[PDB]
Amino acid sequence: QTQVKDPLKLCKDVPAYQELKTQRLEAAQKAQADGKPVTFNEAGTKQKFERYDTAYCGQDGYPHLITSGQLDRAGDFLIPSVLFLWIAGALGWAGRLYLAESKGPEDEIIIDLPKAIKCLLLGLIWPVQAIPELISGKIRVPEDRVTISPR
Amino acid sequence: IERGAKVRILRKESYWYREVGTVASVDKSEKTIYPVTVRFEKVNYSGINTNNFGVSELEEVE
Amino acid sequence: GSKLMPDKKDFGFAFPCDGPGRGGTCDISAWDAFYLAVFWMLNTIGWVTFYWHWKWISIWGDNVAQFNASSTYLMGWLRDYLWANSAPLIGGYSPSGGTNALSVWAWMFLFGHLVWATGFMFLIAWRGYWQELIETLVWAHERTPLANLVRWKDKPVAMSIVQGRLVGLAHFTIGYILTYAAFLIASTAALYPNGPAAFTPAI
Amino acid sequence: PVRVLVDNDPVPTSTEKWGKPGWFERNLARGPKTTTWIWDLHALAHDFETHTSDKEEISRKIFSAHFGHLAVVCVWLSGMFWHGAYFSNFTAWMENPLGLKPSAQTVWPVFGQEILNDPSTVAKGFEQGGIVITSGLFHLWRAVGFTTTGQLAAMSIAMLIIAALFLFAGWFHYHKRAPKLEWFQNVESMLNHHLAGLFGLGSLFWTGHLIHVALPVKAQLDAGIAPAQVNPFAGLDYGLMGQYFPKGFGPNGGLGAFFTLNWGQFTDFLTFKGGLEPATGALYLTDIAHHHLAIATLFIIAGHMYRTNWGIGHSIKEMLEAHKGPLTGEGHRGLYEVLTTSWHAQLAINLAMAGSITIIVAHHMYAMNPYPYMGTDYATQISLFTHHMWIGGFLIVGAGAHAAIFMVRDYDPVTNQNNLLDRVLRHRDAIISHLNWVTLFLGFHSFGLYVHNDTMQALGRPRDMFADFAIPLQPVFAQWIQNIHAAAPGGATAPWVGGTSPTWYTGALSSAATLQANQVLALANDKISISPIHLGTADFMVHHIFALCIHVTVLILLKGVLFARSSRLIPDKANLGFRFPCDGPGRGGTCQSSAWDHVFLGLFWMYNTISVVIFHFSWKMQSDVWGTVDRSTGAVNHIIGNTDVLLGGQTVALSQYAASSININGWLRDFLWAQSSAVINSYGGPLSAYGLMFLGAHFIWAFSLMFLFSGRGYWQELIESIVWAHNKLKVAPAIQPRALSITQGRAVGVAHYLLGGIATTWAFFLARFLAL
Amino acid sequence: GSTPLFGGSTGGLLRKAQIEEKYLIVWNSKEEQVFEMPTGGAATMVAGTNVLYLARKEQCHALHRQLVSTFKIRDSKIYRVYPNGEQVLIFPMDGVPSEKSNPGREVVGYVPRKIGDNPNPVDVKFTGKETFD
Amino acid sequence: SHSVKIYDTCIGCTQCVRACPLDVLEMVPWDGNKAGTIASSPRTEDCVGCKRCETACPTDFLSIRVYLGAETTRSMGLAY
Ligand code: CLA
Ligand code: CLA
Ligand code: CLA
Ligand SMILES: CC(C)=CCC/C(C)=C/CC/C(C)=C/CC/C(C)=C/CC1=C(C)C(=O)c2ccccc2C1=O
Ligand SMILES: CC(C)=CCC/C(C)=C\CC/C(C)=C\CC/C(C)=C/CC1=C(C)C(=O)c2ccccc2C1=O
């Protein structure tokens, strides 16, 4: 057992990140002249480690994310969090909009496209409608209209 | 209760408990225990959409 | 009780099903939820004890950097934990090098794989297959000369629906535990058996 | 009596029915109310007998669906030729078939997946490289005379035209000119045309391709002409045909030798060699041409056996009615009525044969390699054997399924009165109980030997083992058969056959360890294409494992057929159908008593069967056959290489298969643990997709056990609490969520079990042999 | 009456039919015709009274279902035969079919409540009494 | 022998009686429904417990209930 007092520092200070960063750039310059089209070319790899330079790295040299809510690492989890909840909330609200306007079960196996695009467009701004339905209790059915089992 | 009215189910073992069905038939006779026939939007686990209830198991919501 | 079976308490804790009606009702009893959760308990404790063992053999073996690098993806668990530490175990007996002290764990490790896999037969192939098979064996015994003189006192029947689940769970569980115990003991006792445990206090 | 009865435009070609899925069956036409309807739609869509009772309308749907399937296969074949033409290193592989790995799938560079394009496929025309292919398509295309990629592109276009022809005829013979029921029942005319026309003239026309394309192209490549310079029409010029084949295409003229019955001139390009050519490791093309000419003659002859419209020929119904005896009652009477009124009876036979033939293809292709240089492509050899083993096993299980469907749907007591079918049913308890006994015998006396050996080795008693180094179990009958076939070319029973497969020549050796280079067939890359295959104790033991797994699979499928209609348990089982989950928890419990559930259980045992076969093939070929030869010592270095068995300790040298496969720990350590090192280390390179597929297939296999081990009553109750939360927030759907049916939960489980298990071995095999 | 024409099978009677009980099904046939045995296989019924010995009551009732659905033969009778030789008629019991209501039958198994008004299992604890009483 | 109970929700549709492969069930006259009849289970010593009767019963939650009890030769469905 060996205590790690400093598990994380800036990646640009870690020498195992400088190992990796030069080892990736050398592979990107190897494929630029006398090479093959790759996902990370020489300018793509420069920008990749331009982003990782001000990140936190462990001793292996790989970036580690901080998800505690701290705001110098808000791009690590907090900003992808708002982007997720907007897009996932849009798809959830759009299905809820389409379900209420459904003619029947045939609208569930044959998608009514101008109804579906409109619900998917109206779902895009879902917190314009959802939170005024969320404080009113309009988001939920009363308890004596929802089936339950014996107790 | 009469034919056509929307009614809630108080039969707890019913699939449609606390749901709203439509009265399709009320038996005009005595001696019949469960005289009111209710039709529903949801089939149960057997694909059945109707059942018979007493008036004591129904709540008129209309 | 539930919506599928509102009077389930009248049938008790352990019963097979309520038949193929209402869509089909296999594994509806509260006993069957016990049976399903034993798999999930065995899986969870498996994850817990895999994690304890790999973190500690990386400490004992001076390979913590390998644990920190390879535990973040599932191939690292397969290769660096399961595949690498199986080597002294499955070499416990061999045509080239004879046997050593790990031969009993090597044999138990295979035994546990066999018992666990035998559980799958009970868990997958259910009763009505076996009952029709037993009726042909009952026919064969009664028609075979010198053997039909011997008669059972109790009529052979296939195991009940609940019994097939219990016996299948028992083989699955025993095979689960014996395999891991053979692996845990033989990998530790061969590759990482002893260490100092003295330390210098910190100030 | 053989006429053509056709109704004209019986079905209008309209898209009105596309607005209503599930129109074809009376339960589904009422629309979805639950999610069970969705699965019911797919499971019933090709079950044409549930859609109508009209046998003629069922026969019309089948005939038209067959055209659609043929169009699918031709589109698939068109894609293979297209990817060979435009996305391959076929041009560079043709110059160096032994130095370059074939690749015909290249990968776009996003997310870093271009790591799957590898060097050792990189060459000119194929700069970025690609996935190494193991289908053997380049060896097949080179064998039948493809030299350039521009010829593959024309073949891709031709296959799309054949596909569009096939798809049009399916529209035509359903919507425009649909044949009547008596047209389909002309089985004597159908057999005449398929034997003489399809199989006979198909082989005769292929002989003409072999003679005029495949033979002269190979004559030009053997002359040293580069394949870009190879004239493909050289077999159509009689003069250029003269220089390669001086006797058959000579001054003693070609077609002049044919009509004067001077066929001895044709021994230049039609031979009876038998063996493999030592330079390519493949069969002689003149042997292949004479083969297809000889079987064309026999098939065209066979297609004149049955009577159609000219008096002569056999009547199948009168033939079947004559072949009866005292021991078998009325004999084959009524089987003509079975086989001309049941599509399932014909499908059961034709799946049994197609699956069994595909397995014969697997054995015959490794041992008698038809394609030059393919015998040294070990990943191709492994893949082609394994693929056709799996295809054959799946089709045999389907034969058991449709035999059972025949028994439920199309069996009639009036047709089968004391005939062969009726008499099999009347002793089904005798058949199944004897099959129960022989599987128990085989399982004890084959797998128990492995367990004996595991235990003896662990106890430190290797002299008590069943092994070549210990108590031997020699497979003396198979060694006898090998001795017969080794002696037969040139010998008394085949005097003018010049050779046979080299696998037979094991006379003359007592192990694969003591193999010299003169006995093996190595090519110019010094790699062994094929060798004598020694059969010892380990091959005795594994062959009785094969017999165990086949007999259990037979036991399950035959129990499903013979008890499809009734049992002592369920006397009216046929009224419940082919596919029902159970008859309730009574009679002790009747789960999985249906004939469908025997197909379900039989798939796992087929899986167990084919998994042992391909594992046996992989280890035995690596240990005893494949490898390299050294031009010093005449030494054969197999891929694995010769365990020393201690035993005394005076060490005994055996091949690794003979020394180690005789117990389960050897299979676990020396086969599964040792050879998985390629796939678990494949990350960061081009085989890393196999490492991902290896992990992902393990996942899918494990995921299947959720379905196999549980029951739907749990899941339906769990769905109830979840539907409550969707009900509570106005997100409940109108199509009510149901748990999968009991049968579907079994079908989902076995599909994911098979998919995960087979794809694991696929990733294991291909990473093993493409890395070494 | 006589046995239907059948060459015998392995799916018929076992030693239970000698020591415990077997079953007899009797039906009249107007035409000689072929039917499927519940044991497995095809047999021919005579033009007369047919008697057939079967192992279970369910096998007898399955043949009766086949005789009704396929051949329109209605008047089938099922007897339970004891090893001493006693026959007891078990089907049909009162001559009237079970599906048709008949004045004269006693109601058996009647519980005068809907199924969700059964008492709790804690109510019937430490007794052989069940909650379906 | 299994217990086959009939509850007062029976509508007299006779579908359980037709479903039963053992002739356990029959219709007796009643006054509690419009059909004037109710299923009865006089011959439950022949009941195998297959629950085909419960499958045929249309009433929400069912008017006929099979409780699997002590197993006999008859109720286990043994031909031996
Ligand atoms: C209209 C779409 C929709 C919405 C708004 C919801 C909402 C919810 N689901 Mg449900 N669910 C859905 C579809 C939806 N679901 C579908 C199609 C399935 C079958 C796969 C499920 C299966 C399911 C389970 C098993 C559970 C939930 C749960 C929940 C709740 C918690 C969030 C969650 O766990 O999501 C998880 C979502 C899924 C697993 C399904 C997502 C699959 C796709 C993305 C949804 C389909 C989108 C639809 C086609 C869009 C059409 C719109 C267009 C026509 C305009 C939340 C109320 C949980 C709960 O009960 O919490 C209290 C829970 O345990 N859902
Ligand atoms: C040219 C367009 C066309 C149109 C408008 C119709 C219209 C119809 N067909 Mg016909 N048919 C066609 C072409 C067409 N067909 C072709 C090309 C074939 C040969 C395969 C057939 C063979 C055929 C049969 C055997 C039957 C019909 C039936 C029908 C009727 C109902 C079909 C339905 O609702 O299922 C909806 C189906 C789909 C939307 C398509 C399913 C496609 C699956 C998923 C894949 C199929 C692969 C395909 C065949 C091959 C592609 C090869 C390659 C090029 C990719 C409807 C009148 C049915 C009928 O009339 O019953 C009385 C019926 O039984 N058709
Ligand atoms: C020439 C070959 C052939 C033909 C024409 C048929 C035809 C038929 N079969 Mg048979 N059968 C076959 C071979 C064949 N089968 C084989 C090889 C097997 C063994 C597996 C079977 C076993 C079998 C059973 C057990 C049953 C049938 C049934 C049927 C009938 C209905 C099919 C249907 O609608 O299902 C609909 C088809 C689907 C819903 C698609 C199937 C999808 C499979 C299960 C999984 C595919 C996954 C794929 C391999 C990998 C994808 C992974 C990727 C996407 C990630 C139809 C008569 C059924 C019947 O009742 O007959 C009356 C039936 O129960 N067959
Ligand atoms: C306890 C005692 C007195 C022993 C005396 C000494 C004696 C005779 C030892 C012998 C014990 C044994 C091995 C009895 C055979 C067990 C059997 C009927 C297995 C078939 C069977 C299988 C394989 C399933 O998968 C399955 C799944 C779900 C439900 C039912 C079944 C089922 O039935
Ligand atoms: C294009 C596309 C993919 C759209 C998404 C499609 C949409 C909208 C929903 C998707 C629903 C799907 C695809 C699956 C859920 C199936 C399900 C209820 C599983 C639970 C279940 C489990 C886990 C068992 O083990 C089992 C065992 C034996 C019997 C029954 C069961 C059983 O029922």
Report the alpha-carbon distance of residue D132 to residue D767 in Å, rounded.
11
Cβ(C92)–Cβ(C106) under 8 Å?
yes
Pairing of strands E110-111, F37-40: unpaired
Measured CA to CA, the distance from residue C110 to residue C114 in angstroms comes to: 6
CB D213 within 8 A of CB D144: yes
Q: Tell me whether C3 touches chain E (CB under 8 Å).
A: no
Q: Which residues lie below 8 Å from residue D341, measured CB to CB, with a gap of 6+?
A: D55, D185, D410
CA distances from D179 to A126, D14, D63, D166, E90 (A): 58, 20, 9, 16, 54
Question: Do the bridges between strand A63-64 and strand A56-57 make them parallel or antiparallel, or are there none, so unpaired?
Answer: antiparallel
HSE-CB of F4 using CA atoms within 13 angstroms: 29
Distance CA B53, CA B30 (A): 14
- For tokens 């010093």, the residue is D632
Paired tokens of D639 = 């891929």
Q: How far is the CA of D731 from the centre of ligand 1 (A)?
A: 8
b (16+ CB within 10 A) / e for C56-79: ebbebeebeebbbbbbeeebbbbb
* Best to test chain D binding among F50, F64, F73, F74 (most D CBs inside 10 Å): F50
In angstroms, the CA C161 to CA D6 distance is 54
The closest residue, in CA terms, to atom 18 on ligand 3 is D398
Handedness of CA D108, D109, D113, D115 (dihedral sign): positive
Rg of chain F on CA atoms, in Å: 13
E8 at interface of F, judged by CB pairs closer than 8 A: no
The angle, 0 to 180 degrees and rounded to 10, between the axes of the packed helices D285-302 and D215-223 is: 180
For residues B52 and D169, give the distance between their C-alpha atoms in angstroms, rounded to a whole number: 56
Torsion angles phi and psi, residue D456, rounded to 5: -65, -40
Which of B51, B53, B56, B58 to mutate to test binding with chain F, by most F CBs within 10 Å of its CB?
B51
Whole-Å CA distances, D681 to A61, D120, D240, D383, D696? 21, 19, 54, 21, 15
Tell the residue number behind the tokens 């044969």, with chain if given. Answer: D353
- CA-CA distance, C57 to C189, in Å (whole number)? 11
CA angle at residue D647 from D644 to D650, to 5 degrees?
A: 70
C-beta of residue D393 within 8 angstroms of C-beta of residue D609: yes
Amino acid letter at D722?
I
Q: Are D713 and C4 in contact (CB under 8 A)?
A: yes
Backbone phi and psi for residue D633, each to the nearest 5 degrees, phi listed first: 70, -10
Task: Give the ligand whose atoms come closest to the C-alpha of residue D66.
Answer: 2
Query: Does the CB of F21 have a partner CB in chain D at under 8 Å?
Result: yes
Residues B37-58 as b or e (16 or more Cβ within 10 Å = b): bbebeeebbbeebbbbbeeebb
Report the distance separating Cα D139 and Cα D370, nearest Å. 9
Residue E67 is which amino acid? Answer: L
- Judge whether F9 and E115 are in contact, CB under 8 Å: yes
CA-CA distance, D757 to D755, in Å (whole number)?
6
* Cα–Cα distance, C18 to C124 (Å, whole number): 19
Nearest to F79 among D568, D583, D588 (CB): D568
Q: How many CB atoms lie within 10 A of CB D750?
A: 21
User: Distance of CA D548 to CAs C77, D445, D495, D544, Å?
Assistant: 36, 9, 39, 6
F73: left (phi over 0), alpha (psi -120 to 50) or beta: alpha
Residues of B in contact with E116 (CB under 8 A): 11-13
In chain D, which residue's Cα lies nearest the Cα of B19?
D727
CB atoms within 10 A of CB D772: 12
Which residues on neighbouring strands pair with residue E42, listed in sequence order? Answer: E36
Contact, D284 vs D277, CB < 8 A?
yes
Q: C93 phi and psi, to 5 degrees?
A: -145, 145
Is the CB of B18 inside 8 Å of chain A's CB atoms?
yes
Edge-to-edge strands, sheet with A56-57: A9-10, A56-57, A63-64
CB C146 within 8 A of CB C13: no
Q: Does C9 touch chain E (CB under 8 A)?
A: yes
- How far apart CA D102 and CA D98 sit, in angstroms, is 10
Tokens of D767: 């990473």
DSSP-assigned beta bridge partners for residue E26: E51, E77
Where helices occur in D368-500 by DSSP H, the ranges are 378-405, 420-425, 428-458, 476-487
Residue in the structure block whose two tokens are 């579907």: D744
- Total residues belonging to chain F: 80
- Judge whether F67 and C11 are in contact, CB under 8 Å: yes
Q: DSSP state, D172?
A: I
- For C6, the 3-state DSSP assignment is coil
**Residues D288/D275, Cβ–Cβ less than 8 Å:** no
Residue F6 pairs with which residues in a beta bridge? Answer: E110, F64
The tokens 């469905």 sit on which residue?
Answer: F77
Eight-state DSSP code of residue D740: P
Give Cα F12 distance to the centre of its chain.
12
Q: Which of D7, D11, D12, D47 is nearest to D27 (CA)?
A: D47
- Cα distances from A2 to residues A6, C49, C63, C200, in angstroms, run 12, 21, 11, 12
Q: Rounded CA gap, D135 and D117, in Å?
A: 17
Cβ contacts of residue D439 below 8 Å, gap of 6+? D548, D551, D552, D555
Q: Which helix (H) or strand (E) holds E52?
A: strand E49-54
Closest to F31 in 3D by CA, of F13, F12, F14? F12
Beta bridge pairs of residue E25: E52, E78
Per the omega criterion (within 30 degrees of 0), is the bond before E92 cis? yes
> Is residue F64 a contact partner of residue F18, using CB atoms and an 8 Å limit?
no
Q: Can you read off the two tokens belonging to residue A111? A: 């998608």
Q: Which residues in chain E have Cβ-Cβ distances shorter than 8 Å to C142? A: 14-15
Compute CA D231 distance to the chain's CA centroid, rounded to the nearest angstrom: 35
The DSSP string of D610-673 is: HHHHHHHHHHHHHHHT-EEE-SSTTBEEESS--PEE-SSSS-EE--HHHHHTTSHHHIIIIIII
**Smallest Cα distance from E130 to chain B, Å:** 20
Report DSSP letters for D223-267, one per residue: HT--TTS--GGGGTSHHHHHHH-TTTSSSS-HHHHHHTT-GGGGG
Resolution expressed in Å: 2.0
For the packed helices D595-624 and D378-405, what is the interaxial angle rounded to 10 degrees?
160
- Cα separation, D434 vs C5, whole angstroms: 43
D729: buried, middle or exposed (CB in 10 Å: 19+, 13-18, 0-12)?
Answer: middle
Express the helix, strand and coil content of chain E in percent, nearest 5 each: 15, 30, 55
Using an 8 Å CB-CB cutoff, list chain C residues near A150.
Answer: 1-2, 6-7
* Amino acid in position E7: G
d(CA B11, CA E107) in angstroms, rounded, equals 26
DSSP string of D33-67?
Answer: SBTHHHHHHHHHSS-GGGT-S-HHHHHHHHHHHHH
F49-77 burial code (b ≥16 CB/10 A, e <16)? bbbbbbbbbbbbbbbbbbbbeebeebbbb
Residue C46 and residue C176 in contact, taking contact as beta carbons nearer than 8 Å: yes
Q: Do residues D7 and D63 lie in contact, with contact meaning Cβ atoms separated by under 8 Å?
A: no
Which residues fall within 8 angstroms of residue D693, CB to CB, at 6 or more apart?
A: D759, D762, D763
Q: Give the separation between CA E95 and CA E102, rounded to whole angstroms.
A: 10
The rounded distance, in Å, linking the Cα atoms of C2 and D713 is 10
Three-state SS at D288 = helix
d(CA D193, CA D4): 14
Strands E110-111 and F3-7: parallel
**Torsions phi, psi for C103 (to 5 deg):** -65, -30
Q: Encoding tokens for residue D190?
A: 């159908």
Measured from the CB, is residue D166 less than 6 Å from ligand 2?
Answer: no
The count of other CB atoms within 10 Å of the CB of residue D182 is 13
Other Cβ atoms closer than 10 A to F30: 21
**Cα dist. D585→C132, F18, F48, F70 in Å?**
15, 19, 9, 13
What's the token pair of residue D574?
A: 């046929």
Q: Provide the residue type at B39 as one letter.
A: R
CA-closest candidate to residue E41, choices E78, E2, E11, E79: E11
Who contacts D462 (Cβ-Cβ below 8 Å, separation ≥6)? Answer: C95, C98, D456, D469, D470, D645, D646, D647
Touching A: which chains, 3+ CB pairs < 8 A?
Answer: B, C, D
Rg of the Cα atoms in chain A = 25
Smallest-distance ligand from the CA of A115: 1
Could you identify the residue written with the tokens 């080299």?
D502
The Cα-based distances of E102 to E65, E95, F10, F57 in angstroms read 21, 10, 17, 21
